[PDB]
Design an enzyme around this catalytic site. Structure first.
Site, mmCIF file in Angstrom:
data_model
loop_
_atom_site.group_PDB
_atom_site.id
_atom_site.type_symbol
_atom_site.label_atom_id
_atom_site.label_comp_id
_atom_site.label_asym_id
_atom_site.label_seq_id
_atom_site.Cartn_x
_atom_site.Cartn_y
_atom_site.Cartn_z
ATOM 1 N N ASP B 87 -9.828 -16.201 21.528
ATOM 2 C CA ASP B 87 -9.372 -16.604 22.848
ATOM 3 C C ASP B 87 -9.394 -15.410 23.796
ATOM 4 O O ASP B 87 -9.522 -14.252 23.389
ATOM 5 C CB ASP B 87 -7.967 -17.195 22.769
ATOM 6 C CG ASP B 87 -7.631 -18.098 23.951
ATOM 7 O OD1 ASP B 87 -8.487 -18.350 24.833
ATOM 8 O OD2 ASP B 87 -6.484 -18.585 23.974
ATOM 9 N N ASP B 255 -8.383 -25.902 17.076
ATOM 10 C CA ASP B 255 -7.876 -24.619 16.577
ATOM 11 C C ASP B 255 -6.505 -24.675 15.896
ATOM 12 O O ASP B 255 -5.974 -23.615 15.531
ATOM 13 C CB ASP B 255 -7.843 -23.580 17.710
ATOM 14 C CG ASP B 255 -6.894 -23.947 18.850
ATOM 15 O OD1 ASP B 255 -5.729 -24.330 18.588
ATOM 16 O OD2 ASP B 255 -7.296 -23.824 20.026
ATOM 17 N N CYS B 293 -5.576 -35.179 -2.372
ATOM 18 C CA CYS B 293 -6.071 -33.888 -1.928
ATOM 19 C C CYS B 293 -6.750 -33.153 -3.078
ATOM 20 O O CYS B 293 -6.263 -33.149 -4.214
ATOM 21 C CB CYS B 293 -4.915 -33.065 -1.355
ATOM 22 S SG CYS B 293 -5.360 -31.395 -0.871
ATOM 23 N N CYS B 295 -7.447 -29.855 -3.084
ATOM 24 C CA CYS B 295 -7.242 -28.419 -3.004
ATOM 25 C C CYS B 295 -6.732 -27.872 -4.333
ATOM 26 O O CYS B 295 -6.241 -28.609 -5.199
ATOM 27 C CB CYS B 295 -6.276 -28.073 -1.866
ATOM 28 S SG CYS B 295 -4.468 -28.030 -2.245
ATOM 29 N N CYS B 298 -3.030 -28.749 -5.283
ATOM 30 C CA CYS B 298 -2.761 -30.094 -5.776
ATOM 31 C C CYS B 298 -3.453 -30.365 -7.102
ATOM 32 O O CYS B 298 -3.057 -31.290 -7.821
ATOM 33 C CB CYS B 298 -3.174 -31.133 -4.731
ATOM 34 S SG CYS B 298 -2.215 -31.027 -3.172
ATOM 35 N N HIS B 324 -2.649 -25.389 0.950
ATOM 36 C CA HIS B 324 -2.803 -26.836 0.933
ATOM 37 C C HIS B 324 -3.037 -27.406 2.332
ATOM 38 O O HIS B 324 -3.877 -28.302 2.512
ATOM 39 C CB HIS B 324 -1.571 -27.500 0.316
ATOM 40 C CG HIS B 324 -1.467 -28.939 0.684
ATOM 41 N ND1 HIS B 324 -2.227 -29.912 0.073
ATOM 42 C CD2 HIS B 324 -0.760 -29.557 1.657
ATOM 43 C CE1 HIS B 324 -1.971 -31.076 0.648
ATOM 44 N NE2 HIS B 324 -1.096 -30.884 1.619
HETATM 45 C C1 NEZ Z 1 -5.010 -17.611 17.538
HETATM 46 C C2 NEZ Z 1 -4.946 -18.546 18.721
HETATM 47 C C3 NEZ Z 1 -4.832 -19.914 18.546
HETATM 48 C C4 NEZ Z 1 -4.892 -20.781 19.620
HETATM 49 C C5 NEZ Z 1 -5.073 -20.304 20.909
HETATM 50 C C6 NEZ Z 1 -5.285 -21.252 22.064
HETATM 51 C C7 NEZ Z 1 -4.319 -20.987 23.236
HETATM 52 C C8 NEZ Z 1 -4.353 -22.090 24.273
HETATM 53 C C9 NEZ Z 1 -3.524 -23.216 24.171
HETATM 54 N N1 NEZ Z 1 -2.586 -23.484 23.180
HETATM 55 C C10 NEZ Z 1 -1.989 -24.589 23.594
HETATM 56 N N2 NEZ Z 1 -2.461 -25.067 24.767
HETATM 57 C C11 NEZ Z 1 -3.454 -24.205 25.149
HETATM 58 C C12 NEZ Z 1 -4.197 -24.071 26.303
HETATM 59 C C13 NEZ Z 1 -5.013 -22.958 26.459
HETATM 60 C C14 NEZ Z 1 -5.695 -22.736 27.730
HETATM 61 O O1 NEZ Z 1 -5.667 -23.525 28.671
HETATM 62 N N3 NEZ Z 1 -6.390 -21.565 27.802
HETATM 63 C C15 NEZ Z 1 -6.487 -20.662 26.785
HETATM 64 N N4 NEZ Z 1 -7.235 -19.577 27.011
HETATM 65 N N5 NEZ Z 1 -5.891 -20.830 25.599
HETATM 66 C C16 NEZ Z 1 -5.119 -21.988 25.449
HETATM 67 C C17 NEZ Z 1 -5.138 -18.933 21.091
HETATM 68 C C18 NEZ Z 1 -5.077 -18.070 20.014
HETATM 69 ZN ZN ZN Z 2 -3.599 -30.053 -1.605
#
Ligand code: NEZ
Ligand code: ZN
Ligand code: NEZ
Ligand code: ZN
Lengths: 359, 359
Positions: B87, B255, B293, B295, B298, B324
């Site tokens: 990100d 993510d 599952c 994994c 499990c 898991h």
């Molecule tokens: C390791 C890691 C995991 C996940 C993220 C994503 C974080 C994330 C958001 N998380 C919840 N809502 C989100 C909205 C945005 C967004 O509008 N812009 C950006 N740049 N990141 C978001 C960043 C870092």
């Molecule tokens: Zn499992």
């Protein structure tokens, strides 16, 4: 199949021995390191072992020995089909919980009879007699009175074990020598245990704050009092240098909780001594935890990454450290066994200390 | 060899798509779950993945992007030779650290240019544009002003990325749509991103407290505004039911940090819904975490044992739960991909919800 219990000595160098314990669930190569099974996924022996420890004192409180038995016993519970050793709970009740009497200890009651039954319900393969770990320091009179009660409790442990057919026929029972730091009391204790008769003999009442020099001094005269043809288990020990010196004095089995505790606090064991991976000097160190270690962690990741994980509060860092430490101890035990078998253990111990205490 | 970046759609069902992203370091099957790499040992995809996340905001503070570059970049650092997504740090600075201006955010400075350079030093393969995640709720005027600044920052991110030859030739750049919950602002944002041109398009500004119904409503009109022939990444989402509904609305990449966070607190994901393994009702439950599952956890251990470990404070329990959960999400993504490819995703989503919300 395999016998209930056999110990065979394959090679000797001075007081050091190497050999095998045969039990129904598997073979244990000695000298042996016996890790706790709950600290990481322990595999069949690396981050593995021939035998693991169960934590009697914790298990009798959560979820209770009866519940463990209801769930199939510790082997099924933990997914470990090889031997398991359990302590009798006496040390831990006194250290962590207490009202003592000739019957046992209230804190729940714990007696020789109840301790044996608890270890039966857990299904362990090596059962420890119920003893009293004498506090350190102790006067001769207090050490004697405590040792004498432990020997009466050892006889009660023997009888309780023998009265449970499944246990008597499939598990083994170890007696525990007490006597604090006093040669005459250590002798009387060994005498009492040998007259009762056990499958193995533990040296109890050490690793209680006495220091390594005093512990080695006590082992110098105590281990030869035990039957030579049976395994010798030093309880509560210890650091890698403790293990090498104890093997030099005739010990065959070790339970070190340090490697599985040290990992959570950032301490890693290496052939150049312990290091604390959280130290800033490792933030850019691309070497593995130890350059000769064959564990999965050192095959793949740097000190710099494990440092990062632990500093970041990532549980992964502590797990990798624990897996490495368990593996390092098992690599240590393998080198000890190989060097005794090859008649070079004296040189190995010398080489080990010179490097371990250099850095 | 493989191209810098290709996205091919192999099958479609309604708005749902399944396909592959080809990059120099590997292929990513979509819809894809992208776990954080530091939560457990992630393997090549099970407790694995086609692509993992780096944590830009944490890494720029410890040990710093320059130090990561000195150590060989994140691929070498983490021992992961496949794609990595980072990100831009904008969301995290605003959530966790702040002084904002047209130049960027001070908290260290973070600008579009510095964010791109940080992600360059880390060596990630999918680079996110530097945006502002608009807070929720927001008025139309505030949402518009924020979206417009994000679009100017997206152009600056594009230019910074293109001016670093190694990055422009080997990595890919995703633009991030903003506009809060407002269809006209979402349209204007998608328009602006398409005119700049990106390799993929993220739906930003959701999973900020709006609730699932509102999030689905916003996805209903927002995803079709993005180029159909490029991957669609919904940032910050989410629960298994979030993922299924978002795939139904044309999302390709996820993510979810929840599965790697939930594990430490005792929450396990199953096809029958989430459970908290610490609950006493699991103390004697011999079933695995999930009965279907595949994994490693499990295959071997019961709910009763993982319950025991976590209640005992053993880090092993949390690690097994995390492994898991990561595996369950990847099994979910595989079923999603297979069912879209077979033209049965609509039925799968129906079947999934009925069972997931039953228990
Ligand atoms: C390791 C890691 C995991 C996940 C993220 C994503 C974080 C994330 C958001 N998380 C919840 N809502 C989100 C909205 C945005 C967004 O509008 N812009 C950006 N740049 N990141 C978001 C960043 C870092
Ligand atoms: Zn499992
Ligand atoms: C899981 C577990 C690990 C290790 C132990 C051994 C605990 C332990 C000692 N620890 C340090 N010194 C020790 C002495 C004795 C002793 O004299 N008697 C007993 N029964 N245990 C000891 C018990 C349980
Ligand atoms: Zn190692």
């Amino acid at each position: 199949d395999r016998p209930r219990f056999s110990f065979s000595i394959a090679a000797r160098e001075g007081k050091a021995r190497t050999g095998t314990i045969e039990m129904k669930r598997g073979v244990i190569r000695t000298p042996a390191f016996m890790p706790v099974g709950t600290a990481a996924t322990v595999k069949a022996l690396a981050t593995g072992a021939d035998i693991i420890l169960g934590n009697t004192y914790h298990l009798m409180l959560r979820p209770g020995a009866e519940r463990i038995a209801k769930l199939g016993g510790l082997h099924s519970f933990m997914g470990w089909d090889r031997p398991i050793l359990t302590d009798s709970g006496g040390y831990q009740v006194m250290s962590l919980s207490t009202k003592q009497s000739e019957e046992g200890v209230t804190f729940h009651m714990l007696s020789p009879e109840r301790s044996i039954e608890i270890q039966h319900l857990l299904g362990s393969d090596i059962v420890m007699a119920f003893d009293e770990c004498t506090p350190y320091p102790a006067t001769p009179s207090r050490a004697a009175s405590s040792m004498e009660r432990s020997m009466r409790w050892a006889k009660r442990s023997r009888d309780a074990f023998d009265s449970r057919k499944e246990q008597a026929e499939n598990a083994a029972l170890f007696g525990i020598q007490q006597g604090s730091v006093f040669e005459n009391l250590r002798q009387q204790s060994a005498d009492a245990l040998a007259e009762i008769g056990f499958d193995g003999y533990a040296v109890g009442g050490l690793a209680v704050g006495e220091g390594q020099d005093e512990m080695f001094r006590v082992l110098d005269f105590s281990v030869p009092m035990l039957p030579d043809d049976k395994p010798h288990y030093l309880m509560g020990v210890g650091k890698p240098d403790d293990i090498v010196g104890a093997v030099e004095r005739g010990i065959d089995m070790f339970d070190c909780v340090l490697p599985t505790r040290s990992g959570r606090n950032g301490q890693a064991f290496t052939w150049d001594g312990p290091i604390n991976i959280r130290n800033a000097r490792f933030s850019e160190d691309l070497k593995p935890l130890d350059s000769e270690c064959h564990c999965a962690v050192c095959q793949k990741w740097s000190r710099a990454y494990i440092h990062h994980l632990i500093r970041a509060g990532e549980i992964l860092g502590a797990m990798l450290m624990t897996e490495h430490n368990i593996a390092f101890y098992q690599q240590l035990m393998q080198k000890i066994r190989d060097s005794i078998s090859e008649g070079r253990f004296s040189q190995f111990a010398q080489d080990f200390r010179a490097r371990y205490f250099a850095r």
